[PDB]
């Protein structure tokens, strides 16, 4: 009931944080104000365990008896980021149901929600619980309210020590305060609360148990507002009325560089102001209190934060249900996955009409182009699918996994897994409609094959695009590159445009490495197995031979290989993402 959270002589590396030291008890609030130079944020992040870097972390943190160990931070803290991205097509209760259902293993998918209720109603958002969360533009969850929910997700973990980054920032007169309140209330509910506040008002100065200043990662004052209003006048420089006590104090606290003159002078000031209460009684006192908690053992005598969030095998199964749910409740999106592939076939169908086969005037040459386009579009549709849908999920995996919920790949797997249904329907929608309208040897079986041959590319695009979207982080580039890829590919890797066998050395090698080849050399054989054109050539095989001779026999396999890529791509993906958790801090 008095909870203990102290720091002694903490530092960080290129040595951005210097021998800082601070005391807090449950029910209090900590207000960190950091100069634009800051350091503040850096620390706050650091403490939540976000990374542990080239360089180092000096000092140790004392939490309710005992010292914290580097390997336990994330266990005994909770973190609320500068922003709060959430999946735009779910309901509050659903996002929370999934965060909770993912974070903990207990009663049932019914009872979970009941826990959720305590959180929603403890945060006073029950009243929107089951609406379209929305982006601010799409759906109209309150731009204030959303912030609120983000907090909810941390409370399912039942922490009693909470860290919030810049959480006023990006709001308005009314809302900011409304949010601040709720922080403080959480403090009322026997919690520890730490803030890094960029540009707050003069009204709020007076709402803080403990306010504390950082300059260039060097610590300065920490204490009661009144205490600052005194001890800073113990250092001199009293802040007049009509100055914003909260803000004025900072102006003095930070050096800056409009010239060498303004620059050097001020750094001396902030040094002297630092030493001033680096020595002072209060700064002794605060320190002693962090020495107190070890020295004493008292009633709280405990730390706390969550237990078991297990079965990885089980874990992502949820992530899937979530993602499919998202992607399904988004009329915008779904329609396209299924449909565009068809659009391709219509759009062609419209120019090409049906396959004139009577004459040779418009016979092989109309089909070559047709297959070509299919093989060099059905991966395009893939990325068109991916690049557009996935980033949200990707970045949400990013901001989520950091708090400690599901490893980066989990998600990528999930996405990759759901597409199957959709893409596979798309392929069928497309095929069923077009293939017969174009009427290129129509025995159902050979349609059946043609629909399996164009499902693969439409996935390959997806999963490649996916993989890349883990490595490259600026989708619109990914969507240029993957195009270039999946077009270049066809040129070299189906016979059509340069009689592969005939082509000069190296490209030949390349071709064998592209799915394109092993798709085309299906489609050609599947659609020419044997046919007869009126007139150069004459028969179905006589063309098969010219472009891709070993296809006829090899068909059985080709499929094997064509579908071979799609496990690989995703498997690789896993690795890229497994890696990528290290890449961005």
């Amino acid at each position: 009931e008095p909870h203990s959270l102290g720091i002694l002589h903490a530092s960080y590396s290129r040595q951005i944080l210097k021998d800082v030291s601070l005391y807090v008890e449950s029910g209090q609030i900590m207000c960190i104000l950091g100069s634009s130079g800051s350091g503040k944020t850096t620390l706050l992040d650091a403490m939540s365990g976000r990374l542990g870097r080239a360089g180092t972390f000096l000092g140790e943190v004392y939490v309710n008896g005992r010292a914290l160990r580097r390997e336990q931070f994330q266990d005994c803290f909770s973190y609320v980021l500068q922003s709060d991205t959430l999946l735009s097509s779910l309901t509050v209760r659903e996002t929370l149901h999934y965060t909770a259902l993912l974070a903990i293993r207990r009663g049932n998918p019914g009872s979970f929600q009941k826990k959720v209720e305590a959180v929603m109603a403890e945060l006073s958002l029950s009243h929107v619980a089951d609406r379209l969360i929305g982006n601010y533009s799409l759906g109209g969850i309150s731009t204030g309210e959303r912030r609120r929910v983000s907090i909810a997700a941390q409370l399912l973990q039942d922490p009693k020590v909470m860290l919030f980054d810049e959480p006023t920032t990006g709001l308005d007169c009314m809302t900011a305060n409304q949010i601040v309140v709720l922080l403080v209330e959480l403090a009322r509910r026997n919690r520890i609360v730490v803030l890094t506040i960029h540009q707050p008002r003069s009204e709020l100065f007076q709402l803080f148990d403990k306010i504390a200043i950082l300059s260039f990662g060097e610590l300065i004052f920490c204490g009661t507002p009144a205490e600052m209003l005194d001890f800073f006048n113990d250092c001199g420089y009293p802040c007049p009325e009509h100055s914003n006590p909260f803000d004025f104090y900072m102006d003095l606290t930070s050096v800056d560089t409009q010239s060498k003159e303004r620059e050097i002078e001020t750094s001396k000031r902030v040094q002297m102001i630092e030493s001033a209460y680096k020595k002072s009684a209060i700064c002794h006192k605060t320190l002693k209190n962090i020495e107190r908690m070890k020295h004493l053992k008292t009633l709280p005598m405990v730390p706390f934060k969550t237990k078991d969030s297990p079965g990885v095998f089980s874990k992502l199964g949820v992530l899937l249900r979530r993602v499919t749910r998202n992607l399904v409740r988004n009329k915008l999106a779904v329609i396209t996955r299924l449909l565009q592939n068809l659009i391709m076939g219509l759009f062609l169908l419209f120019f090409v009409l049906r396959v004139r086969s009577n004459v040779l005037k418009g016979a092989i040459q109309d089909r070559v182009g047709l297959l070509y386009q299919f093989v060099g579009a059905t991966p395009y549709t893939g990325m068109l699918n991916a690049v557009n849908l996935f980033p949200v999920l990707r970045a949400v995996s990013d901001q989520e996994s950091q708090d400690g919920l599901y490893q980066k790949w989990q998600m990528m797997l999930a996405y990759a897994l759901h597409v199957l249904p959709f893409s596979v329907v798309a392929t069928m929608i497309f095929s069923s409609v077009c293939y017969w309208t174009l009427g290129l040897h129509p025995e159902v079986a050979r349609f059946g094959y043609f629909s399996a041959a164009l499902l693969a590319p439409h996935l390959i695009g997806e999963f490649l695009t996916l993989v890349l979207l883990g490595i490259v982080q600026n989708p619109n580039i990914v969507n240029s590159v993957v195009a270039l890829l999946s077009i270049a590919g066809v040129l070299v890797g189906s016979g059509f445009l340069r009689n592969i066998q005939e082509m000069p050395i190296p490209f030949k090698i390349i071709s064998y490495f592209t799915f394109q080849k092993y798709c085309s050399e299906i489609l050609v054989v599947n659609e020419f197995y044997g046919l007869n054109f009126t007139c150069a050539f004459t028969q179905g095989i006589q063309f098969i031979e010219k472009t891709c001779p070993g296809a006829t026999s090899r068909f059985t396999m080709n499929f094997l290989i064509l579908y071979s890529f799609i496990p690989a791509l995703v498997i690789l993906g896993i690795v890229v993402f497994k890696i990528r958790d290290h890449l961005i801090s």
């Binding site: 004025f248 930070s254 120019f351």
Partner: protein, 562 residues
């Protein structure tokens, strides 16, 4: 803090009566060529809107009530752009130019034909030195990606861009936002300095904090579309001591928020005062060159993009070439040699489209240029850019078009080469314009970059090779005639592979006898050697006209996309 003033000139001021807009409620103004007024309203009270409303450019949904008067006249969107200078939060300065340049280059368009050159030169400096852009003078501007220039300075420059008519009015939207408080002072004091001249200054600061506060001359404080009250720095402190003030700061109160014949005389008097208030008050060619010079300078001092484009093209040529490598055992298969000739044409689009859509769309500048009045579209910008790219575009083509030709061993000597190249030129160039049109008329990088890729995917089918042409609906059958991709292919084909030239088509052991007959047998003899250039240069026309229209009649406005 050092020095006082090197610019100022006179006259105008500003006047209001009972406004309203969906968000505003009954304003009334004092604005007098020397005061600076800080609008210190709540977060989005039509506050960042307010200034844009006052200019006439209204987001919210067009005004409800009101009257607006400048120095001594009504308001008008045609009027304001001759009196008032607007400084946005958005900066749109060209990455690779020096401050001195980015000023001189606008000076040459905003200062009148009559002005001397020495005048422009001295005016530039006469600004620089009033804004104390002392050592920024000959250093490049855009921190955007050179990252070799200060922000506090940058702002002052984009302000300077506006002080080249020494305007009697000046409106700044949230100028501090971004800067460090340390410098905010040193900016807002320069704004006050400006103000001491015969400049009228309007600011809008939603989170001003105390210190900057102290520097206000006039203040207007409003919460969500009502004025709590107008007044000077000091006076406000006292005036809301009709309801009693506190310890913290000056924005606290922002958070807290004829009848008697006696008055009748005052009513009359204010009217009488009021009269007195007003009573006291009472070329294309040249542009065009400037534009291409500035436009072309920056784009040429940009190396990074420039190396890439070269590479970006180069490599395509390399590969296309090798892939159809015309020497060595393997022999180009007339079957195949067409393919190349088609590709070389209908490949580069898929880069160039995105290449030039990207640029045009990453230009919003022109909007602010349109509205601020730097540029026409009569003989002005439509020509500005279309020529601006050109030199790049020539290298871009040559790098892509020569090597392929040789690698794939097309017809020898020269003549053909150049007819070839020259066509590729008009094809790709037509395509650039197509993009420009597509981009300027549509409203989003993504959107224009769809319309384009659909319009292109639609032209390649029409193209001869991949679909045989003759056999078609009228709907393509007609379209094909319009397809630069097709015309490229027929052109190249006619110049290269048929004409009264002669060929050796062949498989395995063969090296056979043949000629122009081949193309006659192919459906392509239809149009002649030299027609096609005209067809594509004509096609160009169509898109060109779409660009000239889309610009002249239709705005390009900002998008966040790329």
């Amino acid at each position: 803090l050092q020095d006082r003033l090197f610019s100022s000139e006179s006259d105008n001021s500003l006047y209001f009566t009972y406004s309203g807009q969906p968000g505003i409620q009954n304003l009334s103004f004092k604005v007098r060529s020397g005061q600076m007024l800080a609008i210190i309203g709540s977060s989005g009270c039509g506050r960042a809107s307010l200034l844009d409303v006052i200019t006439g450019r209204g987001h919210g949904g067009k005004i409800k009530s009101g009257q607006i008067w400048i120095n001594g006249q009504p308001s008008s969107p045609q009027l304001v752009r001759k009196c008032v200078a607007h400084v946005r939060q958005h900066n749109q300065l060209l990455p690779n130019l020096t401050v001195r340049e980015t000023l001189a280059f606008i000076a040459q368009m905003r200062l009148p034909r009559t002005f001397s050159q020495a005048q422009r030169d001295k005016r530039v400096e006469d600004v620089i030195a009033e804004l104390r852009l002392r050592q920024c003078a000959d250093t490049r501007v855009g921190n955007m990606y050179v990252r070799g220039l200060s922000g506090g300075e940058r702002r002052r420059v984009s302000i300077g861009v506006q002080l080249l008519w020494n305007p009697g009015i000046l409106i700044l939207d949230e100028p501090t936002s971004g800067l460090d408080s340390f410098t905010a002072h040193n900016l807002v004091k320069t704004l006050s300095r400006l103000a001491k001249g015969n400049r009228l200054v309007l600011i809008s600061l939603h989170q001003p904090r105390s210190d900057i506060f102290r520097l206000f001359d006039l203040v207007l404080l409003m919460t969500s579309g009502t004025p709590i009250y107008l007044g000077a720095a000091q006076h406000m402190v006292q005036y809301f001591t009709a309801i009693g003030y506190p310890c913290p700061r000056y924005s606290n109160p922002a958070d807290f928020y004829a009848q008697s014949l006696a008055a009748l005389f005052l009513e009359k008097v204010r009217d009488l005062d009021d009269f007195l208030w007003k009573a006291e008050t009472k070329g294309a060619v040249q542009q065009f060159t400037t534009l291409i010079r500035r436009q072309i300078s920056n784009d040429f001092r940009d190396l990074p993009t420039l190396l890439i484009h070269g590479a970006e093209a180069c490599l395509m040529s390399m590969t296309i070439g090798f892939l159809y490598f015309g020497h060595g055992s393997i022999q180009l298969s007339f079957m195949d040699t067409a393919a190349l000739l088609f590709m070389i044409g209908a490949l580069i689009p898929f880069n160039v489209i995105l290449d030039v859509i990207s640029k045009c769309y990453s230009e919003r500048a022109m909007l602010y240029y349109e509205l601020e009045d730097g540029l026409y579209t009569t003989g002005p910008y439509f020509f500005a850019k279309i020529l601006g790219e050109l030199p790049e575009h020539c290298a871009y083509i040559i790098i892509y078009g020569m090597p392929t030709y040789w690698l794939a061993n097309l017809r020898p000597g020269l003549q053909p080469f150049l007819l070839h190249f020259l066509l590729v030129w008009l094809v790709v160039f037509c395509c650039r314009i197509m993009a420009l049109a597509a981009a300027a008329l549509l409203p989003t990088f993504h959107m224009a970059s769809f319309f384009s890729n659909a319009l292109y995917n639609s032209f390649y089918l029409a193209g001869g090779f991949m679909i045989n042409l003759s056999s078609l609906w009228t709907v393509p059958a007609w379209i094909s005639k319009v397809s630069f991709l097709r015309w490229c292919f027929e052109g190249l084909m006619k110049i290269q592979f048929s004409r009264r030239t002669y060929k050796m088509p062949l498989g395995n052991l063969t090296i056979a006898v043949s000629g122009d007959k081949i193309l006659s047998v192919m459906e392509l003899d239809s149009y002649p050697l030299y027609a096609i250039y005209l067809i594509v240069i004509g096609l160009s026309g169509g898109f060109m006209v779409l660009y000239y229209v889309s610009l002249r009649f239709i705005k390009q406005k900002p998008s966040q996309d790329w």
